[PDB]
Amino acid sequence: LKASRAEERERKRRLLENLEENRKMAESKTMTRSVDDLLEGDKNNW
Amino acid sequence: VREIVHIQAGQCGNQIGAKFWEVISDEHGIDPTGSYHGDSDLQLERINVYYNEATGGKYVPRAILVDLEPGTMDSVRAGQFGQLFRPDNFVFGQSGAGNNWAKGYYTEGQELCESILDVIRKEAESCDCLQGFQLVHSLGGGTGAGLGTLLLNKLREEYPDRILSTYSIVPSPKVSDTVVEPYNCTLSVHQLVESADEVFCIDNEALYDICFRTLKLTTPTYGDLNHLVSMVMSGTTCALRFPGQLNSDLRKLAVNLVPFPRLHFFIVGFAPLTSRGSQQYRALTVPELTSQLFDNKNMMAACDPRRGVYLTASAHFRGRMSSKEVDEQMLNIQARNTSYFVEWIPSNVKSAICDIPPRGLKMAATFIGNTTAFRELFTRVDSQFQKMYARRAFIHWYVNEGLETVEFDEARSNMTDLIQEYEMYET
Amino acid sequence: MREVISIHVGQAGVQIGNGCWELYCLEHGIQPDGQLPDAFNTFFSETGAGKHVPRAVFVDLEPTVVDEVRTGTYRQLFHPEQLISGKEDAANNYARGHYTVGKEIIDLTLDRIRKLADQCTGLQGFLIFHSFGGGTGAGFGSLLLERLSVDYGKKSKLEFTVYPSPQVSTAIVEPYNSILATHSMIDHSDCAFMVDNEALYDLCRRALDIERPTYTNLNRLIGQVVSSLTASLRFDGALNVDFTEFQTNLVPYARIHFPICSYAPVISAEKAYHEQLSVAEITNSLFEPANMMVKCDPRHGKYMACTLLYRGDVVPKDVSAAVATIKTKRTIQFVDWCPTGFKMGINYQPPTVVPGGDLAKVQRAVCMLANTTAIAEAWSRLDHKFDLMYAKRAFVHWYVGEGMEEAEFPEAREDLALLEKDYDEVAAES
Amino acid sequence: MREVISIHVGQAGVQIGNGCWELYCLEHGIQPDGQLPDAFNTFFSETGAGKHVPRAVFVDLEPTVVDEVRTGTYRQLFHPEQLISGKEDAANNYARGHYTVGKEIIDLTLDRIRKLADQCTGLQGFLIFHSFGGGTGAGFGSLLLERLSVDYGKKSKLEFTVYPSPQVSTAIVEPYNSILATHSMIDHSDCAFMVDNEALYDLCRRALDIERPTYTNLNRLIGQVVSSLTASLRFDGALNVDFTEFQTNLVPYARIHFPICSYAPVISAEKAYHEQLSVAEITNSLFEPANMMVKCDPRHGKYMACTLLYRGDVVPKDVSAAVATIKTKRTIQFVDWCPTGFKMGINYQPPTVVPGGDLAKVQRAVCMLANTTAIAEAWSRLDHKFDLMYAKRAFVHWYVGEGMEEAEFPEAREDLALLEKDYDEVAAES
Ligand SMILES: Nc1nc2c(ncn2[C@@H]2O[C@H](COP(=O)(O)OP(=O)(O)OP(=O)(O)O)[C@@H](O)[C@H]2O)c(=O)[nH]1
Ligand SMILES: Nc1nc2c(ncn2[C@@H]2O[C@H](COP(=O)(O)OP(=O)(O)OP(=O)(O)O)[C@@H](O)[C@H]2O)c(=O)[nH]1
Ligand SMILES: Nc1nc2c(ncn2[C@@H]2O[C@H](COP(=O)(O)OP(=O)(O)O)[C@@H](O)[C@H]2O)c(=O)[nH]1
Ligand SMILES: [Mg+2]
Ligand SMILES: [Mg+2]
């Protein structure tokens, strides 16, 4: 019945794998790739 | 990601193109200020085909406007959708048009040629992929016919692989707006035959005939005429922009419809065109579209298909409809009128279906066909060019620009050979 | 357990595919997300304790068809790697899909199919779908099989392709693509099943009660045949048929492999209420020319060995009486050197109905695969259409410009001609 | 016990070292200030109280990169004598970083290295980081190895260098610097590993779904390899590999020592959802051309012995099954006089993740170090680039002016020529 341990030990991994790693990555790359828009500033007028 | 670069030349090109972007902007849902204000996610799927994004949710079309005199452009910008275009794509001269093919080709063309190409280079190399270019110009004028052909050769040399689809307006038989048209059209044809992949021919008289016969427009203006042209140019590229049960893009159309390198000139037509009062009686059926597309009066080119024979035909259908019903009609129309089709090519009718129709209209269709009736259109200009050439007419205007008299003999020899080539394949 | 891999090419292959996997997930009891609210191993893999994944690869050279799946409800089921899309399609040009653009994507896909074959411990074959008229279906389909032949070798590669119709046609260059792909198909494929849209249009309007069908309904009917074909590997049955058995039993020679399809009963919901539909009834309906999925009349030719697959309430006693009766039918011919002529299979699990499907639920149904000389009728029509265009050489310039040498046009034309008398020699008897 | 020294030279080394010490401190559980909220002693010294100090020496001849660390978070961690800075950088000039300016700071640097080693009861190796193209990475790196050979002798000196990429290049005089440093490396270094940015960029987009990486993301990937490399000295396991075992197992001759590295799985969260990633799969992912961190195809040459390291719940039964499968691969060529071909490594400590990271918390991962003849072609690219400059004497005036003799230029060309000969003679048939 060590197989009972293994099921929990690996489902715990893939819940962490899915919710946290993916969602953290999705938000971070949404911010990082959309900071390529660098729309100047009114101070430019020299 | 099959981006297309749009080029407009002359008064005819700029006014047709300005109406064209009104159609697409409404179809996708772009506010005239350039911001998306639409109603469906499907509109943002493949807007990259024609537009670029400016930082901050503003979309700019891939348009280049060309003219020799700046009068027409400032008329375009004052239009409601004038603000949309990129200001630095407006490339113009400061000299009169001259209504002269030679003057546009040699005198003012060379000066503007270098500036226009780099503007092309910006839009051409700013996209992930490029399928082909799109040219709109008239052949009776001097700027569209003269400078338009010069740019056509330059585009081919740099970008041989891409599809140089062009839309042209042919000088009319009965009443026309220029004396020297036979010279302008004859010289331009030599450039179109060898360089461009696809040419669509529009006649202004047929547009008047369609308006008075079907649409019953009591006082049509040039807005109504250019409205009809915008739909066909909308329909052909719709396979790129929206999903469908059977896709058919530009490269498919050229392969199927063009059997030989020089026979690629086409006629177009659009259904359904409904009268004001006949609306209450007309029932939307797939056969109802089929009747209008193949009816001779619906063709936008004033060359009667019945006087010649078909080589290939193609139809596009827009909306959700049955696939069986579409395929049956093409089979039926082919067998019912076998006298107008060539024997040595079976299954002359190509078909395709697209999912999203033009807004509000629950089905629509577009037709593109290739036929031997174009011998009618070229015989006309050859006859007029002959009488204008036999004695030297206005020609001295063209010689004083740099053009050699041998170019006229070269131009007509090529034009007459293209007439004979259609004669032979009729056998 | 025992594994099968599905590969889908082109618009036809992909949008047939999502219809088939819609059936299969519904049949086993798997939600669109891959979870559950057995025989999964033949088609799916388990990642950890909860989630399943199809053994499929979707390939097309243009993104419109694939991205419909990517944004759909089923998007979470598939692995992102399985959905492979090119940049620009082949434009119904065999040369473009074989030489210029096909080689741009061939090696990327071959790794992905091979990688999936590692997970299949007891792999026994592949299923591949084509549309003959399509550039990617014919052009890239030939390149895929040529590589796959040397990659795996002694594995059963079955194909399920759409033969261009006798009269219904959507491509002008359609005869050119079919013949060129046929020469590559014949040497490499173990066996490939013929179907055409025109026969499916008539059947699904006559038997199934639909005025105005689309490709969606036709894709369902294809799924029923493939589901019954694979039913022996998944669920219990009194007479099981593995993939390798179809290869040996059906094809008498190497080049004569092409079978045809049939299925019965196809009946509307409110007519199946009206009719008995026993074992003998459905067996009789299989042999009528109307139920054939290829629009060629078998009465023009002769039958070699045929394979029957029954599902549901069928009992082995009634099977033997039914097929024995069909031998008494003198409107059916058999070649003399095939006195046995039949291969039968019986399975227990009934067909799986669909939410909002048109097919009724009979508790007993039968599927047929038959090899006949009547297919030579279809080859003659395809050859005649090709011959007219090639005499004046109406479309050679497009193919030559895209990497194709002309000398391939007559060679593939001769190889078809050899096949035409291959079938005529078999049709004779001594 | 058992301890290793880390020395970082040039921008490319010290910036990677920043990522390395973040990962090590996070893995062991030490706050960046050096306190706690084991295997510590292999990388750190315990000064007393509750504080830890790394065994690291940061060196570059211009202070901008070092002053980032002095002002950065880790300023509380290091021993400021470890942080060594010059006045003006080498300007990508080999002679400047070796003859004129490099000798100004070398004797101060060697003191810190030997002082750091007195506190090391049981040292067993060194880790040194280079970029070949840089003046300080190559010119001063060459001067550093030459002295440490006489200072320490028969202690394994391992290097980790960025190999000049095929097409991506940031220095015009870059090919000049690599060949000059190659002469010094070949005699003194015990073994030097190769990575290059061009493969890491493509690896950092395809597997890890990153639109546009930076130097930060690539530096973490290199940190994982070094952490996996040294884990055999730190954590418990089943098959330990000491530093000296690398020296004998990998290199057959004296001048064929340069290996290349690989790691698996490098996967995002989305894809690992659909993939189990067991022992057999991750071993197959190693040998693909895509996963090589140097953009050279192994299929061009043959393999000498490789060393494999496993981190996770890995059972030795599965290790032999996977490698036996790998020997069944006919696309991987091994040399006949290397019939053994492999060394295994298994450890129980899984990979460590980082906040704001790019990788998944997979249960197991494998690191590969490989010796191959395919990298002989890589030098021939560097040789060809060098010849085009020197045929016209393209940049000789800069090097000659800084003390460098011109006679060294043909000699360095000669040493590379012999090295290229040695590879073709090793790879030749038995
Ligand atoms: N039964 C069935 N046939 C289809 C379906 N869709 C397309 N076809 C057939 O497929 C053929 C057209 O070729 P494509 O489907 O575009 O195949 P392709 O390889 O993607 O062609 P390319 O555009 O060159 O890539 C036609 O003969 C259709 O009859 C479908 O949904 N069901
Ligand atoms: N992986 C990685 N490589 C880097 C990084 N920074 C620089 N490089 C590489 O370093 C190579 C050039 O070496 P240099 O940056 O000149 O290092 P150097 O030895 O200090 O040379 P000098 O600045 O002249 O003193 C380039 O090709 C870069 O690819 C980094 O942060 N990460
Ligand atoms: N369909 C259409 N034709 C036009 C329009 N404006 C001008 N034309 C026709 O285009 C022909 C030549 O136009 P032209 O002024 O010479 O344009 P150019 O190429 O710039 O010289 C004339 O016969 C006009 O009748 C328009 O808005 N729509
Ligand atoms: Mg396709
Ligand atoms: Mg530096």
mmCIF file of C-alpha atoms in Angstrom, chain B residues 35-128:
data_model
loop_
_atom_site.group_PDB
_atom_site.id
_atom_site.type_symbol
_atom_site.label_atom_id
_atom_site.label_comp_id
_atom_site.label_asym_id
_atom_site.label_seq_id
_atom_site.Cartn_x
_atom_site.Cartn_y
_atom_site.Cartn_z
ATOM 1 C CA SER B 35 -9.472 51.729 -32.910
ATOM 2 C CA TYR B 36 -11.219 48.384 -32.630
ATOM 3 C CA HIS B 37 -14.831 48.737 -31.494
ATOM 4 C CA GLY B 38 -16.209 45.508 -32.920
ATOM 5 C CA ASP B 39 -18.659 42.835 -31.848
ATOM 6 C CA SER B 40 -17.004 39.429 -32.392
ATOM 7 C CA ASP B 41 -13.721 37.706 -31.595
ATOM 8 C CA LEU B 42 -13.535 36.288 -35.134
ATOM 9 C CA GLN B 43 -12.731 39.794 -36.397
ATOM 10 C CA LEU B 44 -9.415 39.952 -34.506
ATOM 11 C CA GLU B 45 -8.292 36.500 -35.698
ATOM 12 C CA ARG B 46 -6.559 37.519 -38.930
ATOM 13 C CA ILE B 47 -6.616 41.312 -39.056
ATOM 14 C CA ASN B 48 -2.853 41.077 -39.645
ATOM 15 C CA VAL B 49 -3.565 40.315 -43.322
ATOM 16 C CA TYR B 50 -4.201 43.982 -44.141
ATOM 17 C CA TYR B 51 -3.367 46.008 -41.007
ATOM 18 C CA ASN B 52 -0.513 46.929 -38.705
ATOM 19 C CA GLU B 53 -0.824 47.804 -35.027
ATOM 20 C CA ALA B 54 0.266 51.176 -33.685
ATOM 21 C CA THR B 55 1.218 51.149 -30.007
ATOM 22 C CA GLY B 56 -2.018 51.765 -28.132
ATOM 23 C CA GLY B 57 -4.697 49.798 -29.952
ATOM 24 C CA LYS B 58 -4.737 51.775 -33.214
ATOM 25 C CA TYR B 59 -4.731 49.832 -36.485
ATOM 26 C CA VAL B 60 -3.225 51.186 -39.712
ATOM 27 C CA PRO B 61 -3.880 49.630 -43.146
ATOM 28 C CA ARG B 62 -1.088 48.535 -45.475
ATOM 29 C CA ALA B 63 -1.925 51.172 -48.072
ATOM 30 C CA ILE B 64 0.286 53.172 -50.433
ATOM 31 C CA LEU B 65 -1.284 55.989 -52.459
ATOM 32 C CA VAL B 66 0.375 57.240 -55.645
ATOM 33 C CA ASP B 67 -0.499 60.256 -57.786
ATOM 34 C CA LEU B 68 1.334 62.811 -59.896
ATOM 35 C CA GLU B 69 -0.732 65.799 -58.789
ATOM 36 C CA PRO B 70 -1.698 66.279 -55.121
ATOM 37 C CA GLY B 71 -5.246 67.463 -55.837
ATOM 38 C CA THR B 72 -6.861 64.043 -55.477
ATOM 39 C CA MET B 73 -5.087 63.048 -52.254
ATOM 40 C CA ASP B 74 -6.184 66.063 -50.209
ATOM 41 C CA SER B 75 -9.674 65.266 -51.488
ATOM 42 C CA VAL B 76 -9.217 61.742 -50.112
ATOM 43 C CA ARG B 77 -7.986 62.825 -46.671
ATOM 44 C CA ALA B 78 -10.957 65.168 -46.270
ATOM 45 C CA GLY B 79 -13.023 62.002 -46.609
ATOM 46 C CA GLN B 80 -14.405 60.530 -43.411
ATOM 47 C CA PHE B 81 -11.883 57.656 -43.326
ATOM 48 C CA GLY B 82 -8.966 59.811 -44.502
ATOM 49 C CA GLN B 83 -7.397 59.995 -41.040
ATOM 50 C CA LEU B 84 -6.802 56.225 -41.046
ATOM 51 C CA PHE B 85 -3.887 56.098 -43.498
ATOM 52 C CA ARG B 86 -0.249 56.585 -42.562
ATOM 53 C CA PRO B 87 0.689 60.158 -43.579
ATOM 54 C CA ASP B 88 4.156 59.205 -44.862
ATOM 55 C CA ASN B 89 2.759 56.645 -47.329
ATOM 56 C CA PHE B 90 1.240 59.520 -49.337
ATOM 57 C CA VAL B 91 3.678 59.777 -52.255
ATOM 58 C CA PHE B 92 2.912 62.494 -54.784
ATOM 59 C CA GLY B 93 4.472 64.668 -57.450
ATOM 60 C CA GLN B 94 4.180 68.406 -57.987
ATOM 61 C CA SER B 95 3.530 68.307 -61.728
ATOM 62 C CA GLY B 96 0.475 67.939 -63.911
ATOM 63 C CA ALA B 97 -0.633 64.458 -64.895
ATOM 64 C CA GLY B 98 -0.505 65.304 -68.594
ATOM 65 C CA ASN B 99 -2.959 62.497 -69.437
ATOM 66 C CA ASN B 100 0.053 61.114 -71.309
ATOM 67 C CA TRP B 101 1.352 57.566 -70.969
ATOM 68 C CA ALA B 102 4.854 58.439 -72.182
ATOM 69 C CA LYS B 103 5.160 61.462 -69.892
ATOM 70 C CA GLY B 104 4.081 59.419 -66.880
ATOM 71 C CA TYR B 105 6.359 56.526 -67.826
ATOM 72 C CA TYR B 106 9.544 58.468 -68.605
ATOM 73 C CA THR B 107 9.471 62.076 -67.412
ATOM 74 C CA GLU B 108 7.734 62.026 -64.019
ATOM 75 C CA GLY B 109 7.841 58.264 -63.452
ATOM 76 C CA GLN B 110 11.598 57.979 -62.966
ATOM 77 C CA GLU B 111 11.701 60.729 -60.330
ATOM 78 C CA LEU B 112 8.893 59.159 -58.285
ATOM 79 C CA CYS B 113 9.986 55.556 -58.915
ATOM 80 C CA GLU B 114 12.808 55.528 -56.358
ATOM 81 C CA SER B 115 10.767 57.182 -53.601
ATOM 82 C CA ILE B 116 7.757 54.886 -54.037
ATOM 83 C CA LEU B 117 9.789 51.664 -53.979
ATOM 84 C CA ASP B 118 11.300 52.346 -50.550
ATOM 85 C CA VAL B 119 7.816 53.088 -49.201
ATOM 86 C CA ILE B 120 6.903 49.688 -50.640
ATOM 87 C CA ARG B 121 10.030 48.249 -49.004
ATOM 88 C CA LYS B 122 8.897 49.480 -45.576
ATOM 89 C CA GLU B 123 5.525 47.714 -45.698
ATOM 90 C CA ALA B 124 6.857 44.666 -47.554
ATOM 91 C CA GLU B 125 9.565 43.883 -44.978
ATOM 92 C CA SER B 126 7.574 44.855 -41.865
ATOM 93 C CA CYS B 127 5.520 41.640 -41.846
ATOM 94 C CA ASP B 128 6.218 38.032 -40.917
#
